[PDB]
Amino acid sequence: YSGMETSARGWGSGRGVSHVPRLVNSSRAARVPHAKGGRRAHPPKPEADRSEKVNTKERRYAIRSAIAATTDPTLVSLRGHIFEAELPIVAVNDLESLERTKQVIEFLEAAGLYEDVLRAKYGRHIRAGRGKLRGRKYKHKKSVLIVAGENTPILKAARNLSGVDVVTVDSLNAELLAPGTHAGRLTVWTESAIGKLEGAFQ
Amino acid sequence: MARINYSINGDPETTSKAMGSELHISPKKSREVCCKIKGMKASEARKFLEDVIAMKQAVPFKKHHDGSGHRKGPMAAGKYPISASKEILKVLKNAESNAEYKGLEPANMYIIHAAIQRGRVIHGFMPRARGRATPKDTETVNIEMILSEVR
Amino acid sequence: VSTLDMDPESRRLFNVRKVQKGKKPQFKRTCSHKFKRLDDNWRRPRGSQGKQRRKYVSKGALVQVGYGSPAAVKGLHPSGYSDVLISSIAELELVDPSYEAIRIAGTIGAQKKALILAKAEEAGIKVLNSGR
Amino acid sequence: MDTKKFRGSRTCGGGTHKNRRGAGNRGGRGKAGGCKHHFVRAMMRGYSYGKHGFKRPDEVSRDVSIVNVG
Amino acid sequence: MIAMVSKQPRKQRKARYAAPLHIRQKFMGARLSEALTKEYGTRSAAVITGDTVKVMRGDFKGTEGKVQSVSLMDGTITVDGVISTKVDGTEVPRPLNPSNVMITKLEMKDGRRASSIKK
RNA sequence: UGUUCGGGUCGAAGCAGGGCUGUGAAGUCCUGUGGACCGUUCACAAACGAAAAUCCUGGUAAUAGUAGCAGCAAAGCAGG
RNA sequence: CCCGAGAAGGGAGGUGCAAAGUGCCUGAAACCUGAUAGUGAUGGAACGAUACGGCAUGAAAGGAUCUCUGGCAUGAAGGA
RNA sequence: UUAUGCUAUCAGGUGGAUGGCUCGGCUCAAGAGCUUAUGAAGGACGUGCCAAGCUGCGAUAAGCCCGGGGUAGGUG
Numbered sequence: 031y032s033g034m035e036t037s038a039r040g041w042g043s044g045r046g047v048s049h050v051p052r053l054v055n056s057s058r059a060a061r062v063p064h065a066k067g068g069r070r071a072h073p074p075k076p077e078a079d080r081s082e083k084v085n086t087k088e089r090r091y092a093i094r095s096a097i098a099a100t101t102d103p104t105l106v107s108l109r110g111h112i113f114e115a116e117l118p119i120v121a122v123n124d125l126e127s128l129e130r131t132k133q134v135i136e137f138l139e140a141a142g143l144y145e146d147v148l149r150a151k152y153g154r155h156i157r158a159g160r161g162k163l164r165g166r167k168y169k170h171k172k173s174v175l176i177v178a179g180e181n182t183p184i185l186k187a188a189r190n191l192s193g194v195d196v197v198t199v200d201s202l203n204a205e206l207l208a209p210g211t212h213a214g215r216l217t218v219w220t221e222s223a224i225g226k227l228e229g230a231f232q
Numbered sequence: 233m234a235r236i237n238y239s240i241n242g243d244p245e246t247t248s249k250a251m252g253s254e255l256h257i258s259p260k261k262s263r264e265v266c267c268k269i270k271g272m273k274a275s276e277a278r279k280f281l282e283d284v285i286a287m288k289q290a291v292p293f294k295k296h297h298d299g300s301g302h303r304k305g306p307m308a309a310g311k312y313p314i315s316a317s318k319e320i321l322k323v324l325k326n327a328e329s330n331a332e333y334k335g336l337e338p339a340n341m342y343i344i345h346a347a348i349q350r351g352r353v354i355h356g357f358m359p360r361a362r363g364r365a366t367p368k369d370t371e372t373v374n375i376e377m378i379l380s381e382v383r
Numbered sequence: 384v385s386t387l388d389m390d391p392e393s394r395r396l397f398n399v400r401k402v403q404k405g406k407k408p409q410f411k412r413t414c415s416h417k418f419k420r421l422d423d424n425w426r427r428p429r430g431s432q433g434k435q436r437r438k439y440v441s442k443g444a445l446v447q448v449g450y451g452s453p454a455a456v457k458g459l460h461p462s463g464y465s466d467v468l469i470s471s472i473a474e475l476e477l478v479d480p481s482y483e484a485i486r487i488a489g490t491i492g493a494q495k496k497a498l499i500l501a502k503a504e505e506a507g508i509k510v511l512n513s514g515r
Numbered sequence: 516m517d518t519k520k521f522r523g524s525r526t527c528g529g530g531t532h533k534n535r536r537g538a539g540n541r542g543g544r545g546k547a548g549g550c551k552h553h554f555v556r557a558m559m560r561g562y563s564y565g566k567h568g569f570k571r572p573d574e575v576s577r578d579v580s581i582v583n584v585g
Numbered sequence: 586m587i588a589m590v591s592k593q594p595r596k597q598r599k600a601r602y603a604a605p606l607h608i609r610q611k612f613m614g615a616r617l618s619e620a621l622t623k624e625y626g627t628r629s630a631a632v633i634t635g636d637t638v639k640v641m642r643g644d645f646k647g648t649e650g651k652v653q654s655v656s657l658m659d660g661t662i663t664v665d666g667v668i669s670t671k672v673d674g675t676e677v678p679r680p681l682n683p684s685n686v687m688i689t690k691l692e693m694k695d696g697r698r699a700s701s702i703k704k
Numbered sequence: 705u706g707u708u709c710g711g712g713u714c715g716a717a718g719c720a721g722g723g724c725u726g727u728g729a730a731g732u733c734c735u736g737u738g739g740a741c742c743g744u745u746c747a748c749a750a751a752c753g754a755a756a757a758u759c760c761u762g763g764u765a766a767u768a769g770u771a772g773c774a775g776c777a778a779a780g781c782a783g784g
Numbered sequence: 785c786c787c788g789a790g791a792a793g794g795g796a797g798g799u800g801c802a803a804a805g806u807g808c809c810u811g812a813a814a815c816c817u818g819a820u821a822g823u824g825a826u827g828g829a830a831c832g833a834u835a836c837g838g839c840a841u842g843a844a845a846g847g848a849u850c851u852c853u854g855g856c857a858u859g860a861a862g863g864a
Numbered sequence: 865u866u867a868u869g870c871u872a873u874c875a876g877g878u879g880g881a882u883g884g885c886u887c888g889g890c891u892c893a894a895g896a897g898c899u900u901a902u903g904a905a906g907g908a909c910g911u912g913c914c915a916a917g918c919u920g921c922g923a924u925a926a927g928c929c930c931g932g933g934g935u936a937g938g939u940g
């Protein structure tokens with residue numbers, strides 16, 4: 031009931047003033063959208079439902095299309111990243127055994143994917159506007175996505191590295207693969223992850 | 233409520249300043265007196281203000297010409313301001329004392345600037361008929377003078 | 384700096400634009416000089432009885448596409464070059480001095496601007512606003 | 516409607532500003548005006564007055580499913 | 586101790602502003618010199634009146650002296666040597682912040698001080 | 705807001721006045737002030753664009769040094 | 785320290801990167817005071833658009849086969 | 865030295881817009897959910913060295929006692 035908890039009445043005609051409601055013991059307008067302290071015409075409402083729907087077939091089809099986009103060097107290259115490897119990058123299953131961030135950094139350096147991590151680290155920069163006061167202080171960058179077949183300690187080791195997002199095969203969606211609706215995200219797979227995708231999204 | 237800057241900045245080498253802060257006088261009468269005394273000398277200005285307070289001399293009122301008839305001698309409408317004259321006299325005394333503290337010669341100095349800058353207003357009230365109260369306010373004035381050793 | 388390459392047709396078009404844009408009105412809203420609440424941008428007249436909207440010759444001139452400049456030399460600087468606004472020292476390589484002249488962005492600092500101007504002086508590119 | 520299309524139009528696509536007052540610029544509320552002044556529209560929409568026939572209870576009735584020989 | 590569910594600036598500044606006065610003793614924290622940290626095993630410590638500090642930031646980089654007073658509510662300490670002058674001329678202590686100082690000599694007189702530093 | 709590339713104490717936003725570009729909504733640069741934040745590619749949203757409602761709130765003109773400071777009890781002067 | 789009846793206020797002189805001088809960040813317009821340019825006590829009004837002149841300015845961001853004055857070659861409609 | 869004025873810009877006064885900041889507001893989700901004749905919620909009055917308002921407290925009156933945590937200052 032914002033702006034409307036009032037008992038204002040109009041003065042009618044003959045008083046030499048406008049026809050807006052006023053206070054009962056004064057001449058101050060109230061309750062109307064163009065009066066100071068009055069309500070707002072057409073504000074947002076908590077019962078508005080803003081959820082969207084996408085059919086399961088076309089959602090799976092989009093996910094497959096985004097997964098197949100990481101094979102193309104051109105889409106990955108022009109999208110922002112920096113890499114010196116042969117797409118796609120596939121790793122042996124011991125990658126899920128790594129438990130210290132230093133080991134993951136050693137692997138990334140040896141696989142030619144550490145300059146993207148450094149780019150994401152140094153690209154972190156303060157946001158402009160009213161977003162700073164509400165919790166969104168920085169603007170981040172997206173480096174690399176690591177995919178593992180099953181939960182292992184690798185999801186805890188390659189977790190603090192800047193930009194890197196590590197997930198299992200049963201947790202892939204379209205945000206992870208198309209940040210900002212642009213496919214071509216650098217990613218790493220393993221043999222188990224390749225095994226999980228025989229008929230994963232078909 | 234605070235200090236004030238000046239609309240003219242003469243070089244301190246040959247210059248004297250002074251300000252009257254928030255005087256409770258009419259800004260219009262003070263405007264007319266300030267218009268009359270600008271450009272004269274210090275001693276001539278003080279003598280003229282003495283003769284004005286004595287009711288022996290009339291200041292010509294050119295912009296605010298209402299409420300007045302024509303005076304003797306060669307002029308149209310004019311009055312005999314008193315309170316504004318005394319306030320301006322005090323400010324002139326202070327300016328001359330400052331100039332003589334600077335080591336300059338007051339007797340050969342000119343009023344090269346005298347303006348008014350009306351300040352804040354204290355909002356009073358006066359009760360009318362039929363239950364309405366219209367405002368009556370205490371207007372204030374700021375007086376500024378600059379003396380210089382050049383014509 | 385590289386001499387401009389205005390071939391004769393484009394030079395003719397450039398002089399034509401100079402004359403035509405010389406004889407072009409200001410396109411100011413109606414009655415903007417009689418009130419102070421109104422700024423001096425353009426709004427389309429909208430009342431039905433208004434004299435300007437009814438196209439009286441003395442009221443001014445309405446905005447229409449007939450005043451457009453030639454398409455070959457649209458947007459060029461009056462010196463004849465095309466200006467690109469530079470906001471980093473990684474964009475002077477994407478410029479050719481034959482017809483483009485850079486315009487360093489307003490908020491660039493001092494030593495950044497000094498480095499940009501050194502690389503531009505060596506590169507042969509002409510700089511519109513350089514403090515010299 | 517496209518609100519941004521009408522910034523600076525005043526009437527916003529309604530004609531006079533004397534239209535778009537309330538329910539009297541629509542002829543009544545709901546399907547109001549059955550046969551006095553909306554009779555032609557009432558007949559064309561599919562809202563003609565009348566009652567025709569009866570209904571059997573849904574306990575006894577059935578709706579058979581069909582399949583052709585082809 | 587306020588976990589990662591306090592990532593909102595309003596909450597953090599409320600916590601630091603309206604704090605219980607036994608939590609404001611923790612904000613008087615300052616780094617230890619190398620010997621102190623390698624003999625107590627705590628990377629930092631709290632500043633208490635009577636110990637020698639070495640200023641590290643500001644107008645007095647490198648000047649040493651004792652701590653002449655500490656105020657919990659203000660959040661600032663006072664140090665020997667670091668002063669400001671009045672217009673008429675009178676040397677006055679200038680408040681600092683304990684995160685701009687380094688502790689080089691601890692003042693052990695409580696007895697409970699050693700336990701208070703660590704564990 | 706998501707994403708790509710950036711600027712700023714060797715001076716950001718904002719404000720006053722100017723040069724150039726665009727048919728225009730407007731953009732960009734220069735000078736004075738100011739003392740800490742602001743943009744941009746591709747997309748998506750909205751508590752999104754004011755000259756008018758005897759519009760609302762605040763500030764402030766002219767009228768104007770004007771009316772009033774008389775009507776029923778016209779009260780003061782000298783000396784200290 | 786000087787003026788002032790002064791716990792008013794002003795001047796000089798200091799603090800501070802910077803007066804930011806106490807309801808003290810920035811500090812717009814209306815409105816008011818002064819200065820500068822043009823005009824002005826024989827003069828007719830929607831306060832302006834277009835062309836030609838006087839006076840004042842034209843540092844930056846605008847021009848240098850550009851501005852001014854002329855010669856020569858080709859010249860559409862028209863054409864003495 | 866053309867007065868009373870008109871137009872434009874600049875310097876100052878008044879005023880408090882714009883920008884930047886913000887221990888406040890609002891909405892959703894997860895928890896938790898009775899108290900009082902052993903005198904409640906609410907109110908009046910009092911209570912501070914200098915103390916008017918609010919907050920706390922009750923003639924033991926910005927307060928007293930015990931156990932734990934905390935450590936060098938405290939007096940909303």
Ligand SMILES: [Mg+2]
Nearest residue numbers: 032033067068
């Ligand atoms: Mg409200």
Ligand SMILES: [Mg+2]
Nearest residue numbers: 256257258371
């Ligand atoms: Mg008065």
Ligand SMILES: [Mg+2]
Nearest residue numbers: 361362363364
């Ligand atoms: Mg009455």
Ligand SMILES: [Mg+2]
Nearest residue numbers: 420421754755
């Ligand atoms: Mg308005």
